[PDB]
Design a binder for these strands. Structure first.
Length: 59
DNA sequence: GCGATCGC
DNA sequence: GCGATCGC
């Protein structure tokens, strides 16, 4: 699923930024809450990277 | 170790 | 086929 709300994240390049993830999903084992993961693209470098989403972010 | 996802 | 993403 795509996202729409921006997320505050630290790019691989070190800069803080507000980015709309291209994909989001839940990442959890059986019996545990786990985390939500977003797939982001650093607009300066063009590189993709993953980052934790806030617990209330809509999947 | 468990979970999903995809660019590389 | 794997790295890297986190909290348990």
């Amino acid at each position: 699923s795509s996202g729409k709300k921006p997320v505050k994240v630290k790019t691989p390049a070190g800069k803080e930024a507000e980015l709309v993830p291209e994909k989001v999903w839940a990442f959890a084992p059986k019996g545990r809450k786990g985390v939500k993961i977003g797939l982001f693209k650093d607009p300066e470098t063009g590189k993709y990277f993953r980052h934790k989403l806030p617990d209330d972010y809509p999947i």
